């Protein structure tokens, strides 16, 4: 059993994205997100995602969401 101490205490993160807005204006928009892990399905967390899990998740989703919504929204 390797229960390497999985720190559920908050470890913050921030992500930005340069997007072609509605007017094709290259608008760089930031976004600060507050993420915390769970306890009910940590087995899969460490088995698959290993020790480092938050590093493996946020950037792509944040970037895509920002790009989509900013392209939807005028400056």
């Amino acid at each position: 059993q390797y229960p390497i101490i999985y720190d559920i205490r908050a470890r913050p993160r921030k992500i930005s994205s340069p997007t072609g807005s509605k007017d094709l204006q290259m608008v760089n928009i930031s976004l600060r997100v507050l993420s915390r892990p769970n306890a009910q399905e940590l087995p899969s967390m460490y088995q698959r995602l290993g020790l480092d899990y938050e590093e493996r998740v946020l950037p792509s989703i944040v970037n895509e969401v920002l790009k989509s919504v900013v392209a939807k929204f005028n400056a």
Binding site: Y2, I4, Y46, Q47, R48, G50
Partner: protein
Amino acid sequence: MAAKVFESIGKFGLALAVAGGVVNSALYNVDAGHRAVIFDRFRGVQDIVVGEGTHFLIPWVQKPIIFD
């Protein structure tokens, strides 16, 4: 009598050391999330997996393939 006892002790120790070496070589630590495989020549590689434990190979034919 003592010499015979010492000789037997040495022989037993030598055999034990050989066995330990063999078992360790047939082992790859399946570090957390290291599903290796067992591998031979008669069939290639057994279509069965070494799960995320230190499931074991027979030596030198399974050159430890530790698929992380």
